């Protein structure tokens, strides 16, 4: 999966 | 916002 | 490919 | 920074 971290926001696709 | 396009999913932070 | 947009910065992987 | 992990590439903005 692609992992996205934007400061304290994190999301995986 | 940050945008991360992963195929059909457009993650927006 | 994944497209990333962070304000005026863009990159594609 | 924003971090986007796309397999072995870790995009950092």
Q: How far is A9 from C1, CA to CA, in rounded Å? A: 22
**Are the beta carbons of D13 and C6 separated by less than 8 Å?**
yes
Q: Is C2 helix (H, G, I), strand (E, B) or coil?
A: strand
Q: How far is C3 from C8, CA to CA, in rounded Å? A: 13
| One-character DSSP codes across B1-13 | --EEEETTEEEE-
Give residue for tokens 């924003």. Answer: D2
Point out which residues pair with D4 in neighbouring strands: A4, D11
Spatial contact of D2 and B2, defined as CB atoms under 8 Å apart: yes
Q: In this complex, is the C-beta atom of B4 within 8 Å of any C-beta atom belonging to chain C?
A: yes
Sequence-ordered list of residues with C-beta below 8 angstroms from that of D7, at least 6 positions apart, any chain: none
Q: State the structure-solving technique.
A: X-ray
Number of CB atoms found within 10 A of residue D11's CB? 20
Could you tell me the resolution of this structure in angstroms? 2.0
Question: What phi and psi values does residue C3 have, to the nearest 5 degrees?
Answer: -105, 130
Query: Which three-class secondary structure string do you get for chain A?
Result: CCEEEECCEEEEC
Q: How far is B5 from D5, CA to CA, in rounded Å? A: 13
């Amino acid at each position: 999966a692609v992992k996205v971290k934007v400061x304290p926001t994190k999301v995986k696709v």
